[PDB]
Structures are given as C-alpha cells and as structure tokens.
Amino acid sequence: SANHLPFFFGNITREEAEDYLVQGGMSDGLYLLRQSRNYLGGFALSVAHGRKAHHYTIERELNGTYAIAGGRTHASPADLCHYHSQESDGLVCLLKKPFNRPQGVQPKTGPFEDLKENLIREYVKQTWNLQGQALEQAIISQKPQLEKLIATTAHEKMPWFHGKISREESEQIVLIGSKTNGKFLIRARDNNGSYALCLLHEGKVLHYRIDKDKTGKLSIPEGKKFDTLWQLVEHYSYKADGLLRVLTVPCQKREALPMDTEVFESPFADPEEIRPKEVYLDRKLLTLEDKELGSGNFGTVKKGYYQMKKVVKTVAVKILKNEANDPALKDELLAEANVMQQLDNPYIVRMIGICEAESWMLVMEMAELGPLNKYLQQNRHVKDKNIIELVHQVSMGMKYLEESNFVHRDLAARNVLLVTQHYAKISDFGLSKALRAPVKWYAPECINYYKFSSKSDVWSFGVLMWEAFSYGQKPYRGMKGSEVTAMLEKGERMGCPAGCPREMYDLMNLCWTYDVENRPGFAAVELRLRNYYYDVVN
Template identity: 50%
Template sequence: MATDPAAELPFFYGSISRSEAEEHLKLAGMADGLFLLRQCLRSLGGYVVSLVWNVEFHHYSVEKQLNSTYCIAGGKPHCGPAELCEFYSNDSDGLVCTLRKPCLRSPDNPIRAGVFDNLRDNMLREYVRQTWNLEGEAMEQAIISQAPQLEKLIATTAHERMPWYHSKIPRQEGERRLYSGAQPDGKFLIRDREESGTFALSLMYGKTTYHYQILHDKSGKYSMPEGTKFDTVWQLVEYLKMKPDGLVTVLREPCVNRNNTKQTPVVPSGVSIKNILHGRYSLSNVFIEASAKWLIIIIIILLLNTVHFFQRRLRTNGYTPPPGVPLGGSKEIKTSPPTDRPMLPMDCSEFVNPYHDPNDLKKFFINRDQLMIDEVELGSGNFGCVKKGVFKTNKGHTDVAIKVLKSENEKLVKDEMMREAEIMHQLSNPYIVRMLGLCQAECLMLVMEMASVGPLNKFLSTNKDKVTVENIVGLMHQVSMGMKYLEEKNFVHRDLAARNVLLVNQQFAKISDFGLSKALGADDNYYKARTAGKWPLKWYAPECMNFHKFSSKSDVWSFGVTMWEAFSYGGKPYKKMKGPEVISFIASGSRMECPSGCPDRMYALMKDCWTYKHEDRPGFVKVEECMRVFYYSISNKTPPEVTADAAEPLK
C-alpha cells in the first residue's frame, strides 16, 4: 500500500465496502462531520469520502482525473487526497457539512489492500522491463513518470491473475468445474466467450448453474445487463461479491482454476521485490516465468489481430454477425451487398488507432527536427494560427496540422494550450482529432492529425449540390459517436459546433478544438465556470448562459445546434440575433425552424436536444442510438444490434 497517495492518512481504511465504512462510523459515535476515506471500487485510483450528518451516512466519490488531480463531483481539483480532505475540512463546497472529525483507524486495524494493490507493483515492473527493456533506476523513473497511464493499462489484464479466471473454456466445461467438489451457493468462475475480448460469468445456486454474459460497451466498461459499469472485469467481480446486481445471488466462493498457468503471478507467490533485492530469490527464475508469459500474450495478440483483420474484411464484403446470437454463439449470416463507399471506423468491430505506437506512453513532447512546417495557413485566431506540416517518424512521414502559438500571446495562452494538449492526448477515438504531441521550440506548437477537407460548415456551404441528406445524417451520426465517447470519459467539450467538426473526406468527420473542454468528476456531473469570457452563446444551453454550468447534457444542446447547421448546409443559427435576444428567444419556448429538406425525424431529435431543463434532455447514449437507427434506415447497410427503445422518439 506504500504506493497509494492516501496510505499515510490515519483515517484512510483502504479497500473496505460501504457497509463496513458505515460500521466504523457507527462505532466511532456518529457525530456530525465524522468522516473516513476509503478506496473507490468503481474508478481506478479513486476514493470515497464517507461522512456522517444528522445520524445519516453520505458517501462522496473522489475521482482521479487524467491529469492526476482528484475532485469530488462538481468540486475543485486537488493535487492529492490529503489536500482534498484538508480543503473540505474548511469549506463544505457542496457536501452536507465540512469534514469535522476524522474516524481514525485503530492500531490493530491496518489498511486493507485491494485486489489490484497486491498485484500492481510486480505487474508495473514486469511491463516496463518487458516493453521498454529497462532495469534499475531507469525502470523506477519510467514507472514514476508514467504511473497513471501504466496502471490503467495493466489493470485491464489483472483479472488473468485471479483464481476465478478460467480463460477460454466451453460452457459445459465451466459447469463441470463448478459441479466438481463442494457446490455452495455463490460458487463462481469467469471464462472467455467465443467473441474476442468478451466474458461470461458462470454461477452456482441451488445446485443449478446459471450463465450470464458480461457486457462490454464501446467505452471499454464492463457490466451485467442493466447493471453498474466498471473499468475492469476484476472490479465488477469485487462489486458482485457485495451486491447481486441482477444475479440470482452474490458471488461468494471462487471456483479456483488449477489448470491454467496464466494464473501464476509474474513474481511467484510469496516472492516480493524486496526478497529479490536481498538475494532470497533468483531474478533469473522470475525472468524465465515472465518471459514465457509475455511470449504467450504476444502470440495471442498477433492471432487476435489476424482474426479481427479477417472479420473486418468479411464485414466489408457484406457479412455481419446477427443481433441476439446466443451466449457463446459464433454463427454468421449474409446481409445486404457491399456499397462502393470506403470502409469507415463505424463499419469495424473495433477501432484500430492509425497513430498507435507502443512507445506512445513515452512520447508527449516532439522534437523540432521531426517537424516540417509549411507556410500555408489552414486557419487563424487570437491565439495564433494553424499550419500544414509533416511529422517525421520511424514509420515514415505523416501529414499533420500544427497549431502555432503567437510569441506575443505565450504568457496568456500557453497554459490553456498545454491544458488542451493534456486533454487531447488522453483521447483515442476515430471521431475525435488525434493529438500527436507538443513541440516547444521557437514557439509552442500543438501537433494534431490532419483532416484535410476542413470544417463541416464551410464544406457544406460550398458543396451543396454534392452532399445528400444521407451523407449529412452519416456525418452527424459519427459526431454523435464521438460525443458519446467523451460523455463516457466524463469530458464536456463546451464548444461543439459545425466549425469544430473537421472532415477527413466527404464521408468521415472528426470533432476538434478542445480549448474550452473540462474533465468532469463523475457521470451526470457538471462543471461551473467562474467567469463568462468569450463564449459561443448561440450554441450554449440555457443553464450555460444563465448559471455558467456545463455538462454532457449542455453538449447535447450544442449537438442540436450543430445538426441544424449541417442540415442548413452551413447556415448561421439564429440569423442576426444578438446574445441577449437568443436568451429571450429560447426562454419564451421558441426554437429554430426546421431547415428546408431536413427529415422530420432529424428535426424531432434537434428539438429533443433543445429541451429547456437539462435533467429532461437526452444523453448522448440516446442521441447516438436515434442517429444510428435513422442512418441505417435510409442506407443500404445492416445496423448492429440496438436496444428496443432506440427506434422510438426520445420524449
């Protein structure tokens, strides 16, 4: 637990459940403001503040942000959990009361390590050793500098070290293993399904075996059907040990896998780094076991990539798996014939980042000699300009767009540009412009992937005769998928507009310009801006203009305005109205009229996006479903499986 930033806090209990936290608070007297800190199971690296007020318990999630700060939903970011608790001891800032009295751990009650805590150090070191070939001080520095990214990376494979993980076995074999030996209620195992990257839970109850599919959504989260979502499989399992979440019973006793060598830890059981350093265990033994394991993993990855390549080729030739294939099914059916349109990311089963490089974790800053900058300007603004350029790498030369900061603006804008770079560097989605890195040379430069056709509004206004309604629907569907990804990652864009949707070609759109973006603390949360500044009011929701509150729901409003721009072929929203006139127009219940030629279904979605109260407004999950269903209804393509209510109006 030494690596946990909260380990030195006397009121930090580690990985305990909500009910255990409440029991500790009860035993400590239930005084108003009594509190403790514990690990959060739902978010990697996060915490929960458990607090007493008026003889009731209140639990506040503390999210770890991508920039390694911590914040409670709707609150200010802090550099660590200690600083966060100190702040809330003086200012409630949305809590029911200030943190008044810490509930201290007793000396005989050590911090409880979580499942991942017991594996993390060994997995980090082994990953750095195998991937970057580092040892000693260089390894330690790499771990320190890249810990947040590395921890999330290795956490997704930590389930392979768990005793309940049985790798790829058939359903019948899973049942045989559960029936072997004692058969208590709650005995369980996790196994791989036929479809790569998906899992099934097999559970014993009343001497009967039940099988559940573990859902894996596009954002990478795991859940039971209609259940709580988690970043990893092992977090989901730990949660299901406390709550059934739709299962017939909670998980209790793991069905231990004694046959799979993948269960063997990288460093054998009972062997610590400390023991190795003191010569109690041979490092060569560890290295032999680790090398064999990673060789197997590399072979599996290569095989899976080959399978996915052929799956994508099948899809382009008119094949797609049918909706509702039974658990473990692998049947395929032939669907509509292929079109002449080139394959897009939305046609693939997974997103393969064209800029992916295993060494990306080490790269954020780009050397000046890797860039060739053209004098041609793609655009300009108060901060500087965007120029066309070439990024030279070992893989070859790549066309890029380079946002160049004017030297006279450096002090004013540098921090904002750095923040934009930090945000964009964390995002990897086919419908979001990829940030490749920062270059600090004669001036600060933000290097981004090129979307050569340019802004959507300009393209539509100059190519009205070439763009069909179906084309626009397809592009806006892609924007909705990009925004759904941001919503799932707890980011609010704050500047979604047709000018910030860039086209790679006429059929492929990407969201850009994250200068106003903010990372939110939790789902359904909002960011409150301190000052108004220069804001694009015609794209802003009422709560943004009136209360300076921004959320994914306010981005939904902006998406509706962006749709209006697209179906108006680059028209300007609200015509010649000024900001105050727009506010009054919206408050009166009025909305922009349906653009000429816009399908009724799309205008109905716009109006849903323009629902005045943000709590009644649909989220991007619903918006994307509606866009998807309509897009596939007017095209030749067969849609993937959607929920039953996706085809219905959002009201």
C-alpha cells in the first residue's frame, strides 16, 4: 500500500497523470506516483522534464521489494522515490517536487477498482466460454479493450445495484453487519432514470437522489453529470464532491476482437471434433482453390477447405517445393512437422497437420488479411496504439514458443499474418530448420556461429518491431549483409521510426543486445511490452 503518500493517486490513466503534471506547472523534476495498470501490485512514476512527461513502471519483486527495469531493489515505493530524489539511476532526471493530490481527491484504489480484474475474467468466460490458457491469453492481449467493454454492461447485474428495493429496505440492508464507512448501494426510485444512492457514514444511512436530466445524463443535486451509473460509482469512489465521503464497499444483494474469430481457439477445442491421431491428414478431406495466395522460398500458399464433423474448416495450405521431396530431408521434415503440430496458442498460425500427396502439404489456420508488412504499407492510417497491440500479441506467441523450447529462426513482419486488424498470428515457425535451409533479421551469433536460439529470435523480434513501426519498410535500407554485420559490431543500430514511441525504440535496442547472455528472453520482452501497452491504451 501507498495510500498514505500525499502524491499517490492510485489507478488513474497515463493521460490523467499528465493532466495533473500540467496542472502542477510542468516544472523539471515535478512528479507523482500511481498504480501500475497491470493487476500485478506494482506502481508507476510520472515525471515532468523538458516539457514532456516521463513514465516508469515500478515492479513488485518476489520478496515484496520494488524495482524499475530489473534495477536496484527498494523496500517500498516511498523509499524508491526518496532514492530517486538524490540519484537518477537511469531516470530522465532527479525527483524534485511531488505533485500532491488536489484538495478533495483521494487515491483511486477502492473496492470498485478491485472488482475490475474479476469482472473482465467473468466477461470472457461468459461471452466466449473460454477456459485455461485460451482464457488467460484472451485477457492478457485484450485487457484494455475488455475494461472498456465491462463499463458498458447493464447496471442491473452490478453488485452495488439492488434494483426496486424500497427506501426502508435499503436503510436496513446498508445497516446489517460491520458498519464500514462508505458501504453503499444504488436502488431505482422509478423506471425512468430516477435512482437513490444510500451511503453509510459513522453508522447512519445517507440517502442521495440520482436524477436523469433531459440530455440523458445522471447526477446527484448540483453534482458532475455522468452517462452511466458505472461512471457515477467510479467517480464517487475517489472524489466525494457533494457526498459526505467516498463510496467504498458495495452492500451484499476485418476489425473483430480476436475471440470473435473461429481461429482464436484450436479447430479441435470442440470435444465432438475428431483430432488426428498423428501428424498426417486425410487428403480426401481437403479441397484447394485454383488461385494462389502467394509464394516464398519454401513453397506456394493456397486457400483450402478441410472437412470436419460439425463444419468445413477454411484453411491455408502451403505446398512445399520439389526440393522438399528429396529422401535425405524426409525424417527431419516429419520430425519438425510433429513438433509444429504440438504447438497450440491463439497467437500462432496453428499447424493442423500434413498431407503427403502430389507434394508435401502443410495445412494451417487461415489468416486472411495476409502479412503484417504488406498490410501496414497499404493501410498507413493504422494507429501507433493498434501497432503496439499487434506486436504485443507477437511477443505472446513468441513467449509461448520459447516456453515450448521451439526456435522460430525466421521471425520477421512477412511471417506475422493478420486474421483481423486487431489479431496477429506468427507463421512459418521452424520451417527453415524443417527444410535444412534473411541476414538483416539474424542476431550476430547466427551469422558468425550458426547458433539459433530463443535469444536470437528476440533479436529478430526487435527488427520486426522496427518494420511494424516503419509501416512495412525494409530494414537497413540498401545495405549489403557485410555492411550490416560491420555496423552492428560498431554498436550502431537502426534509427527510431517516425512516430514510434520512445519506450518501443528502447525495447528494440534491448532486443538488439549484442551479448546473448545479457539479451532478454521473451518472458521479459512480453512483460515490458504488456506494461507499456496497458499504460498507453485506454
């Protein structure tokens, strides 16, 4: 807890924190503390310097201590702030003057805020019937979109809404049990937007009227206007305004979201569907379209249809080149295909199985919008926040591959395929290894020692992030491979793309760590990306 700190604001947005620093005059070293927007019990420090706001995630360590970017440990966020008032230790400047919560503003950390994580979890379970890893993977990518969604749900299902209870009933229900100050409920006074807010204050029930104006807005007499009871409760849980005190505990009574697609879950998630007993698929159940979707170094891709029990599944089929028919390649191709088929995550193009027919055929999930680099080059109106969402999903798919001890070897924007504008999937994982086989995407140890690992996939991910933020431009423009190797040895790197956030360019640079040992793994990359994504996207 940090509620005792007068400059601690709780769970506010990054923009609200910047608005407060502007309110405080934007002087160099002016700062405030807030809660990390990730449900991980961390904090965020917002500092003014050179007329810009600088934000840093404070992570809670396993032993209950706190640190920024794997840096030094601090006993508490107050102690971290004190240390940073004398030594920068990586921050833009020293912490000079705190911006205290204005008069009448309490930390945004009450029971209303606490309910959010479980509400989003319950919303995914109910809306999409997701469980286990599919459920956790939905939440991690879509937390900001899901928080916006739960705010629009009907007030009647909220724990603080008691419906058509009378004034006398509300009085008795607010008084039963422990007399927690701020204990409250909302009841309907009629069926035309008239409500009452009953609040416990030093053992007495206060009955406030909530009325709907001609413009459809809700308010208490002379109070701030709100479009919903959700917004009204959120506000009053940290700014009492016209109330005697804040609300606390409720009284006891092409643009689709990833989960809205048929490829979010595995085609075999339905227990009545027949999962193939091995890597092989029945060619008799597969139909290909005449026209190709494209081609590459390993084969041609066509749209296809795979006959299953309940439905016909639209698939993408990669028909491998004649070179893959060589008997010398067979065992490793089949061995890699088996391992590809084991992989199951929403952020990868799942490899359904293989057909040994006229040619070797890899049957995959369909990602109809095609590759990320070509999509961004054709759709330059795609916002920076949408690119962050897409690259974060790639870091999730890669975290899963790393956990599965699977090295991609060709991670690049051409190998990130879009199901929707808000749903990316990693494709062609392990294909270059399967076919016994791009230098601009290779880590220095790959070109020098042929050492491919999850760490060299991290390096590739940095180049991919650069491609994404550059709207599908080519990396190291016009340079030969030898010039790229020499430039990297000098410690030089590609520049920050136009409009690319500074935290995203710092993450690229971290992926481009020369030394393999010091380069982060995908767990660290995904978490750093997730923290930034959750702080900027509201």
